[PDB]
Amino acid sequence: MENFQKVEKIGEGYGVVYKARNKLTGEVVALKKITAIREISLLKELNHPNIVKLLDVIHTLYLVFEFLHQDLKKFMDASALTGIPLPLIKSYLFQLLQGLAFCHSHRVLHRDLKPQNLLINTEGAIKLADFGLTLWYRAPEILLGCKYYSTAVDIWSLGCIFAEMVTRRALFPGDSEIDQLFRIFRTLGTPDEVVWPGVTSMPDYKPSFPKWARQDFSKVVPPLDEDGRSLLSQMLHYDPNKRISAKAALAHPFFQDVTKPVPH
Ligand SMILES: O=C(O)c1ccc(F)cc1
Ligand SMILES: O=C(O)c1ccc(F)cc1
């Protein structure tokens, strides 16, 4: 639109994302060019320090967001040789659990959490961006064809991301829906009715799924301490109803010594 001057493409998702200058405010913004109105009103009222601000909705459908240059994916890549320091891992994890708790207590699900979608600033903040309006962070209930999923899908994604900051490798780098499912099964064991009541009734569940044994989490995320492994295990419970909430995750002993370091 004529009050916005394009600076450069930020990325491509539903649509395309540009860095743009607002000619009216002089502000630099992220401009995303693309039932929906109620969804986008819920996003425009969601205001929290760990949620990217939806500044303006222009229907002529452009969504004007606050701009941040850096994301967690870019940061993980630049940090690959040394790793993200654990204080910063813990700070990023704690802040995303806060944004998620806010979202979830306002009946908003993210649905598509990934490192790419997590924007960081120079002061040590991290913010949920690009709400769901490639498969690595997908909860197994979504992969098993469940259409009426819960807030627990965002917890699973955040658990995957937590594991990835710790080990500097994606936890479950699936390249199709079945490879994704089977990567989850080879690590955590093939779910059954014992650990996940109702799993064998999921729309895309097949009795012919191979039966893998579970690996110990001490093998999965070394050198993470017992508090970090305890919390990760609770974020990665098969049964969405056993999966810890973002609010109860905030009171976990892992966050006892949480601080907010400056990234460098
Ligand atoms: O898609 C978003 O939500 C988004 C992406 C980049 C950015 F700087 C701000 C918002
Ligand atoms: O969902 C879990 O957390 C879980 C699944 C299988 C198992 F053997 C232990 C825990």
PDB file of C-alpha atoms and ligand atoms in Angstrom:
ATOM      1  CA  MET A   1       0.000   0.000   0.000  1.00  0.00           C
ATOM      2  CA  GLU A   2       1.167   3.626  -0.836  1.00  0.00           C
ATOM      3  CA  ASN A   3       2.080   4.638   2.796  1.00  0.00           C
ATOM      4  CA  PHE A   4       4.619   1.705   2.900  1.00  0.00           C
ATOM      5  CA  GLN A   5       7.989   1.631   1.087  1.00  0.00           C
ATOM      6  CA  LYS A   6       9.576  -1.862   0.561  1.00  0.00           C
ATOM      7  CA  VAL A   7      13.118  -2.286   1.941  1.00  0.00           C
ATOM      8  CA  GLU A   8      13.626  -6.093   1.323  1.00  0.00           C
ATOM      9  CA  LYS A   9      12.010  -9.549   1.532  1.00  0.00           C
ATOM     10  CA  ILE A  10      12.241 -10.965   5.108  1.00  0.00           C
ATOM     11  CA  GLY A  11      10.826 -14.342   4.002  1.00  0.00           C
ATOM     12  CA  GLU A  12       7.967 -16.405   2.554  1.00  0.00           C
ATOM     13  CA  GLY A  13       5.344 -18.505   4.367  1.00  0.00           C
ATOM     14  CA  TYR A  14      -0.312 -18.023   3.390  1.00  0.00           C
ATOM     15  CA  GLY A  15       1.874 -15.200   1.954  1.00  0.00           C
ATOM     16  CA  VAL A  16       5.093 -13.085   1.690  1.00  0.00           C
ATOM     17  CA  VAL A  17       6.869 -10.998   4.430  1.00  0.00           C
ATOM     18  CA  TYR A  18       8.717  -7.699   3.639  1.00  0.00           C
ATOM     19  CA  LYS A  19      10.710  -5.276   5.788  1.00  0.00           C
ATOM     20  CA  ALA A  20       9.016  -1.934   5.062  1.00  0.00           C
ATOM     21  CA  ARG A  21       9.129   1.694   6.120  1.00  0.00           C
ATOM     22  CA  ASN A  22       5.877   3.312   7.287  1.00  0.00           C
ATOM     23  CA  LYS A  23       5.965   6.737   5.560  1.00  0.00           C
ATOM     24  CA  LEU A  24       3.427   8.128   8.122  1.00  0.00           C
ATOM     25  CA  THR A  25       5.228   7.081  11.404  1.00  0.00           C
ATOM     26  CA  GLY A  26       8.751   6.651   9.945  1.00  0.00           C
ATOM     27  CA  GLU A  27       8.671   3.232  11.640  1.00  0.00           C
ATOM     28  CA  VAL A  28      10.330   0.149  10.168  1.00  0.00           C
ATOM     29  CA  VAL A  29       7.848  -2.766  10.146  1.00  0.00           C
ATOM     30  CA  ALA A  30       7.372  -6.354   8.938  1.00  0.00           C
ATOM     31  CA  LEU A  31       4.660  -6.348   6.280  1.00  0.00           C
ATOM     32  CA  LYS A  32       2.957  -9.694   5.690  1.00  0.00           C
ATOM     33  CA  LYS A  33       0.908  -9.678   2.433  1.00  0.00           C
ATOM     34  CA  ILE A  34      -1.706 -12.512   2.221  1.00  0.00           C
ATOM     35  CA  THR A  35     -14.014 -16.544  10.712  1.00  0.00           C
ATOM     36  CA  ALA A  36     -10.672 -14.848   9.803  1.00  0.00           C
ATOM     37  CA  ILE A  37     -11.630 -11.444  11.324  1.00  0.00           C
ATOM     38  CA  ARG A  38     -12.383 -12.944  14.808  1.00  0.00           C
ATOM     39  CA  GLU A  39      -9.072 -14.918  14.585  1.00  0.00           C
ATOM     40  CA  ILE A  40      -7.071 -11.801  13.547  1.00  0.00           C
ATOM     41  CA  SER A  41      -8.889  -9.670  16.243  1.00  0.00           C
ATOM     42  CA  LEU A  42      -7.764 -12.234  18.869  1.00  0.00           C
ATOM     43  CA  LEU A  43      -4.182 -11.828  17.539  1.00  0.00           C
ATOM     44  CA  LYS A  44      -4.444  -7.973  17.520  1.00  0.00           C
ATOM     45  CA  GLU A  45      -5.538  -7.916  21.211  1.00  0.00           C
ATOM     46  CA  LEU A  46      -2.869 -10.483  22.289  1.00  0.00           C
ATOM     47  CA  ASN A  47      -0.337  -8.037  23.664  1.00  0.00           C
ATOM     48  CA  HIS A  48       2.501  -9.514  25.790  1.00  0.00           C
ATOM     49  CA  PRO A  49       6.324  -8.821  25.810  1.00  0.00           C
ATOM     50  CA  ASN A  50       6.929 -12.338  24.383  1.00  0.00           C
ATOM     51  CA  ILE A  51       4.452 -11.960  21.488  1.00  0.00           C
ATOM     52  CA  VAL A  52       5.390  -9.953  18.311  1.00  0.00           C
ATOM     53  CA  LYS A  53       3.000  -6.997  18.093  1.00  0.00           C
ATOM     54  CA  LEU A  54       0.415  -6.980  15.342  1.00  0.00           C
ATOM     55  CA  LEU A  55       0.460  -3.165  14.780  1.00  0.00           C
ATOM     56  CA  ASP A  56      -2.129  -2.835  11.936  1.00  0.00           C
ATOM     57  CA  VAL A  57      -4.534  -4.796   9.667  1.00  0.00           C
ATOM     58  CA  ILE A  58      -5.014  -3.285   6.179  1.00  0.00           C
ATOM     59  CA  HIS A  59      -7.814  -4.766   4.102  1.00  0.00           C
ATOM     60  CA  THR A  60      -7.567  -3.494   0.484  1.00  0.00           C
ATOM     61  CA  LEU A  61      -4.910  -8.316   3.229  1.00  0.00           C
ATOM     62  CA  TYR A  62      -1.681  -6.854   4.754  1.00  0.00           C
ATOM     63  CA  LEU A  63      -0.711  -7.552   8.393  1.00  0.00           C
ATOM     64  CA  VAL A  64       1.735  -4.917   9.781  1.00  0.00           C
ATOM     65  CA  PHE A  65       3.923  -6.390  12.563  1.00  0.00           C
ATOM     66  CA  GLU A  66       6.697  -4.809  14.681  1.00  0.00           C
ATOM     67  CA  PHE A  67      10.055  -5.624  13.011  1.00  0.00           C
ATOM     68  CA  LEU A  68      12.873  -7.634  14.631  1.00  0.00           C
ATOM     69  CA  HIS A  69      15.867  -8.596  12.504  1.00  0.00           C
ATOM     70  CA  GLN A  70      17.061 -11.799  14.197  1.00  0.00           C
ATOM     71  CA  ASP A  71      15.345 -15.125  14.801  1.00  0.00           C
ATOM     72  CA  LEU A  72      16.237 -18.264  16.899  1.00  0.00           C
ATOM     73  CA  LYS A  73      17.075 -20.366  13.768  1.00  0.00           C
ATOM     74  CA  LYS A  74      19.609 -17.703  12.621  1.00  0.00           C
ATOM     75  CA  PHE A  75      20.926 -17.538  16.224  1.00  0.00           C
ATOM     76  CA  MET A  76      21.178 -21.399  16.584  1.00  0.00           C
ATOM     77  CA  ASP A  77      23.096 -21.474  13.207  1.00  0.00           C
ATOM     78  CA  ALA A  78      25.577 -18.697  14.241  1.00  0.00           C
ATOM     79  CA  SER A  79      25.917 -20.424  17.672  1.00  0.00           C
ATOM     80  CA  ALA A  80      26.540 -23.950  16.201  1.00  0.00           C
ATOM     81  CA  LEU A  81      30.305 -24.122  17.078  1.00  0.00           C
ATOM     82  CA  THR A  82      30.072 -23.269  20.844  1.00  0.00           C
ATOM     83  CA  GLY A  83      26.347 -23.754  21.460  1.00  0.00           C
ATOM     84  CA  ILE A  84      23.885 -21.386  23.091  1.00  0.00           C
ATOM     85  CA  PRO A  85      24.988 -20.908  26.751  1.00  0.00           C
ATOM     86  CA  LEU A  86      22.576 -22.782  29.072  1.00  0.00           C
ATOM     87  CA  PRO A  87      21.584 -19.520  30.971  1.00  0.00           C
ATOM     88  CA  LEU A  88      20.371 -18.147  27.604  1.00  0.00           C
ATOM     89  CA  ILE A  89      18.697 -21.474  26.640  1.00  0.00           C
ATOM     90  CA  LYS A  90      16.815 -21.362  30.017  1.00  0.00           C
ATOM     91  CA  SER A  91      15.924 -17.635  29.591  1.00  0.00           C
ATOM     92  CA  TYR A  92      14.600 -18.215  26.012  1.00  0.00           C
ATOM     93  CA  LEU A  93      12.672 -21.321  27.194  1.00  0.00           C
ATOM     94  CA  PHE A  94      11.161 -19.423  30.249  1.00  0.00           C
ATOM     95  CA  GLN A  95      10.088 -16.390  28.117  1.00  0.00           C
ATOM     96  CA  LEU A  96       8.406 -18.621  25.415  1.00  0.00           C
ATOM     97  CA  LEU A  97       6.538 -20.573  28.158  1.00  0.00           C
ATOM     98  CA  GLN A  98       5.273 -17.122  29.393  1.00  0.00           C
ATOM     99  CA  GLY A  99       4.057 -16.064  25.916  1.00  0.00           C
ATOM    100  CA  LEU A 100       2.504 -19.510  25.455  1.00  0.00           C
ATOM    101  CA  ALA A 101       0.789 -19.336  28.924  1.00  0.00           C
ATOM    102  CA  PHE A 102      -0.679 -15.919  27.969  1.00  0.00           C
ATOM    103  CA  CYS A 103      -1.874 -17.265  24.512  1.00  0.00           C
ATOM    104  CA  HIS A 104      -3.374 -20.426  26.029  1.00  0.00           C
ATOM    105  CA  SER A 105      -5.195 -18.590  28.891  1.00  0.00           C
ATOM    106  CA  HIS A 106      -6.753 -16.414  26.076  1.00  0.00           C
ATOM    107  CA  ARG A 107      -7.794 -19.575  24.104  1.00  0.00           C
ATOM    108  CA  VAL A 108      -5.189 -18.836  21.333  1.00  0.00           C
ATOM    109  CA  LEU A 109      -3.053 -21.735  20.007  1.00  0.00           C
ATOM    110  CA  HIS A 110       0.135 -20.998  18.034  1.00  0.00           C
ATOM    111  CA  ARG A 111      -0.022 -24.362  16.027  1.00  0.00           C
ATOM    112  CA  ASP A 112       3.227 -23.756  14.124  1.00  0.00           C
ATOM    113  CA  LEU A 113       6.079 -23.076  16.552  1.00  0.00           C
ATOM    114  CA  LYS A 114       9.515 -23.320  14.992  1.00  0.00           C
ATOM    115  CA  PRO A 115      12.916 -21.603  15.475  1.00  0.00           C
ATOM    116  CA  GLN A 116      12.323 -19.503  12.259  1.00  0.00           C
ATOM    117  CA  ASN A 117       9.161 -18.114  13.967  1.00  0.00           C
ATOM    118  CA  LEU A 118      10.881 -17.025  17.207  1.00  0.00           C
ATOM    119  CA  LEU A 119      12.213 -13.472  17.023  1.00  0.00           C
ATOM    120  CA  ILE A 120      15.006 -12.240  19.296  1.00  0.00           C
ATOM    121  CA  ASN A 121      16.303  -8.784  20.231  1.00  0.00           C
ATOM    122  CA  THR A 122      19.694  -7.398  21.464  1.00  0.00           C
ATOM    123  CA  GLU A 123      18.380  -7.144  25.065  1.00  0.00           C
ATOM    124  CA  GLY A 124      17.761 -10.860  25.623  1.00  0.00           C
ATOM    125  CA  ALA A 125      14.031 -11.020  24.715  1.00  0.00           C
ATOM    126  CA  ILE A 126      12.420 -13.717  22.528  1.00  0.00           C
ATOM    127  CA  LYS A 127       8.912 -13.358  20.933  1.00  0.00           C
ATOM    128  CA  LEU A 128       6.373 -15.715  19.337  1.00  0.00           C
ATOM    129  CA  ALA A 129       5.809 -14.719  15.694  1.00  0.00           C
ATOM    130  CA  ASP A 130       3.975 -16.015  12.612  1.00  0.00           C
ATOM    131  CA  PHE A 131       0.954 -17.644  14.357  1.00  0.00           C
ATOM    132  CA  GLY A 132      -0.836 -20.427  12.459  1.00  0.00           C
ATOM    133  CA  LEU A 133      -3.757 -18.724  10.659  1.00  0.00           C
ATOM    134  CA  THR A 134       8.379 -27.767   8.137  1.00  0.00           C
ATOM    135  CA  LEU A 135       7.211 -30.978  10.012  1.00  0.00           C
ATOM    136  CA  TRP A 136       9.996 -31.228  12.641  1.00  0.00           C
ATOM    137  CA  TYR A 137       8.043 -29.594  15.532  1.00  0.00           C
ATOM    138  CA  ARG A 138       4.643 -31.173  14.781  1.00  0.00           C
ATOM    139  CA  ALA A 139       2.875 -32.921  17.726  1.00  0.00           C
ATOM    140  CA  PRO A 140       2.064 -36.640  17.131  1.00  0.00           C
ATOM    141  CA  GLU A 141      -1.728 -36.080  17.498  1.00  0.00           C
ATOM    142  CA  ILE A 142      -1.617 -33.721  14.436  1.00  0.00           C
ATOM    143  CA  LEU A 143       0.499 -36.316  12.500  1.00  0.00           C
ATOM    144  CA  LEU A 144      -2.066 -39.008  13.485  1.00  0.00           C
ATOM    145  CA  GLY A 145      -4.929 -36.976  11.897  1.00  0.00           C
ATOM    146  CA  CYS A 146      -6.498 -35.434  15.013  1.00  0.00           C
ATOM    147  CA  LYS A 147      -8.415 -32.321  13.919  1.00  0.00           C
ATOM    148  CA  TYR A 148      -9.554 -31.130  17.398  1.00  0.00           C
ATOM    149  CA  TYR A 149      -6.174 -30.757  19.058  1.00  0.00           C
ATOM    150  CA  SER A 150      -5.319 -28.621  22.160  1.00  0.00           C
ATOM    151  CA  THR A 151      -2.788 -26.176  23.633  1.00  0.00           C
ATOM    152  CA  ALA A 152      -0.539 -29.285  24.207  1.00  0.00           C
ATOM    153  CA  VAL A 153       0.551 -29.104  20.506  1.00  0.00           C
ATOM    154  CA  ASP A 154       2.533 -25.878  21.261  1.00  0.00           C
ATOM    155  CA  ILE A 155       4.183 -27.493  24.319  1.00  0.00           C
ATOM    156  CA  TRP A 156       5.366 -30.438  22.146  1.00  0.00           C
ATOM    157  CA  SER A 157       6.844 -28.016  19.508  1.00  0.00           C
ATOM    158  CA  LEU A 158       8.553 -26.024  22.328  1.00  0.00           C
ATOM    159  CA  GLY A 159      10.000 -29.273  23.777  1.00  0.00           C
ATOM    160  CA  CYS A 160      11.485 -30.090  20.309  1.00  0.00           C
ATOM    161  CA  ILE A 161      13.011 -26.566  20.143  1.00  0.00           C
ATOM    162  CA  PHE A 162      14.368 -26.857  23.749  1.00  0.00           C
ATOM    163  CA  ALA A 163      16.087 -30.175  22.809  1.00  0.00           C
ATOM    164  CA  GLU A 164      17.530 -28.504  19.614  1.00  0.00           C
ATOM    165  CA  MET A 165      19.027 -25.473  21.479  1.00  0.00           C
ATOM    166  CA  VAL A 166      20.641 -28.021  23.925  1.00  0.00           C
ATOM    167  CA  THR A 167      22.123 -30.527  21.379  1.00  0.00           C
ATOM    168  CA  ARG A 168      22.579 -28.161  18.347  1.00  0.00           C
ATOM    169  CA  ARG A 169      20.668 -30.798  16.148  1.00  0.00           C
ATOM    170  CA  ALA A 170      16.939 -30.964  15.342  1.00  0.00           C
ATOM    171  CA  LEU A 171      15.259 -33.535  17.599  1.00  0.00           C
ATOM    172  CA  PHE A 172      13.065 -35.150  14.919  1.00  0.00           C
ATOM    173  CA  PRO A 173      14.102 -34.002  11.418  1.00  0.00           C
ATOM    174  CA  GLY A 174      11.307 -35.788   9.464  1.00  0.00           C
ATOM    175  CA  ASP A 175      11.030 -35.295   5.697  1.00  0.00           C
ATOM    176  CA  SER A 176       7.434 -36.644   5.276  1.00  0.00           C
ATOM    177  CA  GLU A 177       4.540 -37.215   7.691  1.00  0.00           C
ATOM    178  CA  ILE A 178       5.416 -40.919   8.110  1.00  0.00           C
ATOM    179  CA  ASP A 179       9.222 -40.290   8.445  1.00  0.00           C
ATOM    180  CA  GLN A 180       8.310 -37.638  11.100  1.00  0.00           C
ATOM    181  CA  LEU A 181       6.044 -40.130  12.945  1.00  0.00           C
ATOM    182  CA  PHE A 182       8.652 -42.904  12.801  1.00  0.00           C
ATOM    183  CA  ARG A 183      11.482 -40.589  13.975  1.00  0.00           C
ATOM    184  CA  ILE A 184       9.296 -39.789  17.041  1.00  0.00           C
ATOM    185  CA  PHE A 185       8.565 -43.549  17.518  1.00  0.00           C
ATOM    186  CA  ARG A 186      12.246 -44.691  17.192  1.00  0.00           C
ATOM    187  CA  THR A 187      13.259 -42.237  19.983  1.00  0.00           C
ATOM    188  CA  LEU A 188      10.312 -42.258  22.431  1.00  0.00           C
ATOM    189  CA  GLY A 189       8.991 -45.774  21.592  1.00  0.00           C
ATOM    190  CA  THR A 190       5.858 -46.669  19.574  1.00  0.00           C
ATOM    191  CA  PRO A 191       2.869 -45.289  21.590  1.00  0.00           C
ATOM    192  CA  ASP A 192       0.223 -47.748  22.775  1.00  0.00           C
ATOM    193  CA  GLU A 193      -3.021 -47.635  24.815  1.00  0.00           C
ATOM    194  CA  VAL A 194      -1.032 -47.911  28.127  1.00  0.00           C
ATOM    195  CA  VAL A 195       0.902 -44.613  27.685  1.00  0.00           C
ATOM    196  CA  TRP A 196      -1.696 -42.889  25.407  1.00  0.00           C
ATOM    197  CA  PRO A 197      -5.313 -44.052  25.948  1.00  0.00           C
ATOM    198  CA  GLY A 198      -7.129 -43.510  22.641  1.00  0.00           C
ATOM    199  CA  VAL A 199      -4.017 -43.562  20.371  1.00  0.00           C
ATOM    200  CA  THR A 200      -5.213 -46.697  18.462  1.00  0.00           C
ATOM    201  CA  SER A 201      -8.514 -44.780  17.594  1.00  0.00           C
ATOM    202  CA  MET A 202      -6.680 -41.759  16.026  1.00  0.00           C
ATOM    203  CA  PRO A 203      -7.873 -41.285  12.345  1.00  0.00           C
ATOM    204  CA  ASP A 204      -4.450 -42.122  10.766  1.00  0.00           C
ATOM    205  CA  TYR A 205      -3.266 -44.683  13.319  1.00  0.00           C
ATOM    206  CA  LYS A 206      -2.290 -48.038  11.708  1.00  0.00           C
ATOM    207  CA  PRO A 207      -1.827 -51.290  13.754  1.00  0.00           C
ATOM    208  CA  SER A 208       0.927 -52.117  11.206  1.00  0.00           C
ATOM    209  CA  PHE A 209       3.140 -49.277  12.647  1.00  0.00           C
ATOM    210  CA  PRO A 210       6.468 -51.031  13.677  1.00  0.00           C
ATOM    211  CA  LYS A 211       6.970 -51.296  17.454  1.00  0.00           C
ATOM    212  CA  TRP A 212      10.089 -49.406  18.566  1.00  0.00           C
ATOM    213  CA  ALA A 213      11.547 -49.417  22.081  1.00  0.00           C
ATOM    214  CA  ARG A 214      11.996 -46.107  23.912  1.00  0.00           C
ATOM    215  CA  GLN A 215      15.469 -44.524  24.284  1.00  0.00           C
ATOM    216  CA  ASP A 216      16.513 -42.917  27.630  1.00  0.00           C
ATOM    217  CA  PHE A 217      16.431 -39.065  27.561  1.00  0.00           C
ATOM    218  CA  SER A 218      20.035 -39.116  28.939  1.00  0.00           C
ATOM    219  CA  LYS A 219      21.025 -40.379  25.405  1.00  0.00           C
ATOM    220  CA  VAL A 220      18.615 -37.883  23.719  1.00  0.00           C
ATOM    221  CA  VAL A 221      19.731 -34.480  25.180  1.00  0.00           C
ATOM    222  CA  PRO A 222      23.242 -34.822  26.810  1.00  0.00           C
ATOM    223  CA  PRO A 223      24.698 -32.798  28.667  1.00  0.00           C
ATOM    224  CA  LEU A 224      21.257 -31.501  29.924  1.00  0.00           C
ATOM    225  CA  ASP A 225      20.909 -31.846  33.743  1.00  0.00           C
ATOM    226  CA  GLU A 226      18.136 -33.893  35.495  1.00  0.00           C
ATOM    227  CA  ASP A 227      15.836 -30.823  35.973  1.00  0.00           C
ATOM    228  CA  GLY A 228      16.095 -29.975  32.242  1.00  0.00           C
ATOM    229  CA  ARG A 229      15.522 -33.656  31.253  1.00  0.00           C
ATOM    230  CA  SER A 230      12.560 -33.951  33.728  1.00  0.00           C
ATOM    231  CA  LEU A 231      10.909 -30.866  32.240  1.00  0.00           C
ATOM    232  CA  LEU A 232      11.645 -31.986  28.627  1.00  0.00           C
ATOM    233  CA  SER A 233      10.132 -35.434  29.293  1.00  0.00           C
ATOM    234  CA  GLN A 234       6.902 -33.739  30.577  1.00  0.00           C
ATOM    235  CA  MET A 235       6.732 -31.533  27.435  1.00  0.00           C
ATOM    236  CA  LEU A 236       7.131 -34.669  25.276  1.00  0.00           C
ATOM    237  CA  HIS A 237       4.503 -36.986  26.865  1.00  0.00           C
ATOM    238  CA  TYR A 238       2.634 -38.797  24.051  1.00  0.00           C
ATOM    239  CA  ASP A 239      -0.813 -38.268  25.621  1.00  0.00           C
ATOM    240  CA  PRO A 240      -1.722 -34.539  25.119  1.00  0.00           C
ATOM    241  CA  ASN A 241      -3.604 -34.723  28.484  1.00  0.00           C
ATOM    242  CA  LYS A 242      -0.411 -35.801  30.329  1.00  0.00           C
ATOM    243  CA  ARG A 243       1.723 -33.109  28.600  1.00  0.00           C
ATOM    244  CA  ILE A 244       2.647 -30.334  31.089  1.00  0.00           C
ATOM    245  CA  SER A 245       0.909 -26.937  30.551  1.00  0.00           C
ATOM    246  CA  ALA A 246       2.991 -23.738  29.900  1.00  0.00           C
ATOM    247  CA  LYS A 247       1.775 -22.410  33.317  1.00  0.00           C
ATOM    248  CA  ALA A 248       2.886 -25.503  35.293  1.00  0.00           C
ATOM    249  CA  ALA A 249       6.207 -25.605  33.256  1.00  0.00           C
ATOM    250  CA  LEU A 250       7.005 -22.080  34.593  1.00  0.00           C
ATOM    251  CA  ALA A 251       7.035 -23.446  38.202  1.00  0.00           C
ATOM    252  CA  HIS A 252       9.435 -26.295  37.272  1.00  0.00           C
ATOM    253  CA  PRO A 253      12.724 -26.536  39.391  1.00  0.00           C
ATOM    254  CA  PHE A 254      14.733 -26.049  36.107  1.00  0.00           C
ATOM    255  CA  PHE A 255      13.777 -22.293  36.263  1.00  0.00           C
ATOM    256  CA  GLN A 256      14.922 -21.853  39.930  1.00  0.00           C
ATOM    257  CA  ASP A 257      18.176 -20.047  38.804  1.00  0.00           C
ATOM    258  CA  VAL A 258      16.637 -18.439  35.647  1.00  0.00           C
ATOM    259  CA  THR A 259      18.136 -15.025  34.655  1.00  0.00           C
ATOM    260  CA  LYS A 260      17.962 -12.931  31.470  1.00  0.00           C
ATOM    261  CA  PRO A 261      21.449 -12.831  29.786  1.00  0.00           C
ATOM    262  CA  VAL A 262      22.372 -10.505  26.897  1.00  0.00           C
ATOM    263  CA  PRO A 263      22.961 -12.615  23.672  1.00  0.00           C
ATOM    264  CA  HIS A 264      26.504 -12.307  22.153  1.00  0.00           C
TER     265      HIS A 264
HETATM  266  O1  LIG B   1       5.434 -13.355  10.289  1.00  0.00           O
HETATM  267  C1  LIG B   1       5.572 -12.704  11.352  1.00  0.00           C
HETATM  268  O2  LIG B   1       4.790 -12.771  12.340  1.00  0.00           O
HETATM  269  C2  LIG B   1       6.760 -11.775  11.447  1.00  0.00           C
HETATM  270  C3  LIG B   1       7.944 -12.055  10.767  1.00  0.00           C
HETATM  271  C4  LIG B   1       9.021 -11.190  10.863  1.00  0.00           C
HETATM  272  C5  LIG B   1       8.898 -10.067  11.634  1.00  0.00           C
HETATM  273  F1  LIG B   1       9.951  -9.212  11.718  1.00  0.00           F
HETATM  274  C6  LIG B   1       7.754  -9.766  12.311  1.00  0.00           C
HETATM  275  C7  LIG B   1       6.674 -10.620  12.221  1.00  0.00           C
HETATM  276  O1  LIG B   2       4.635 -40.596  27.056  1.00  0.00           O
HETATM  277  C1  LIG B   2       5.611 -40.796  27.820  1.00  0.00           C
HETATM  278  O2  LIG B   2       6.145 -39.915  28.532  1.00  0.00           O
HETATM  279  C2  LIG B   2       6.199 -42.185  27.886  1.00  0.00           C
HETATM  280  C3  LIG B   2       5.937 -43.114  26.884  1.00  0.00           C
HETATM  281  C4  LIG B   2       6.492 -44.379  26.950  1.00  0.00           C
HETATM  282  C5  LIG B   2       7.294 -44.694  28.012  1.00  0.00           C
HETATM  283  F1  LIG B   2       7.842 -45.942  28.067  1.00  0.00           F
HETATM  284  C6  LIG B   2       7.581 -43.807  29.006  1.00  0.00           C
HETATM  285  C7  LIG B   2       7.033 -42.540  28.948  1.00  0.00           C
END
